[PDB]
């Protein structure tokens, strides 16, 4: 198998940034994220290189950059800050248990 | 030898927290952290085994349940509640960056 476990995104709660993680899917990025944490602030950088700030905005970045996937490549969209901000939170929340290494799936129903 | 950074505990920020952390490391619990987020959810439930829930409290552990050191035989105390979750929600942040197996060193001040 290709994951270890499955995160199911709460897309009617954060839906602007669940449109984002559905269409990035639909569009090959990956639905799996490898957990790195070491390298996330690099793969930022690279993932945002050269994409100014919209204000009321937010830039998320999919596949993120706690993940092998993310960094160079990656899909970015402008989510309002509000959707984008109660989403890190529920991610960070829910990554917060799985060691580094670890393949979580991401479903989007 | 023993730790890969130093994390410093704002005992001024959360007292309560603080306090029973300082007590704990005075009791021989380790003031060091070795990352394992995994096992967190059996730790818990081995630490606070015959502990139950109170309404204005959390159950605080030292050594944390996110920690090698944590589970059976950790230093439990009832914080109340706002002091605690400000605690972990300070804490949480402090060490998302850093990957599974980081030795944190927490100094209480």
Redesign the interface.
């Known amino acids: 198998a290709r994951y270890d476990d499955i995160l199911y995104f709460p897309a009617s709660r954060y839906p602007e940034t669940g449109a984002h993680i559905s269409d990035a899917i639909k569009a090959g990025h990956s639905d799996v994220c490898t957990i ?3 390298g ?2 690099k793969r930022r950088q690279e993932s945002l290189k050269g994409i100014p700030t919209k204000p009321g905005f937010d830039r998320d970045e999919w596949p993120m950059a706690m993940c092998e996937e993310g960094g160079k490549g990656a899909s970015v969209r402008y989510v309002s800050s509000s959707d984008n901000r109660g989403a890190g939170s529920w991610v ?1 929340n829910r990554l ?7 393949r979580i799936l991401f479903i989007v129903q």
């Open positions: 790195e944490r070491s996330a602030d960070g917060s248990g799985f060691a580094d290494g670890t």
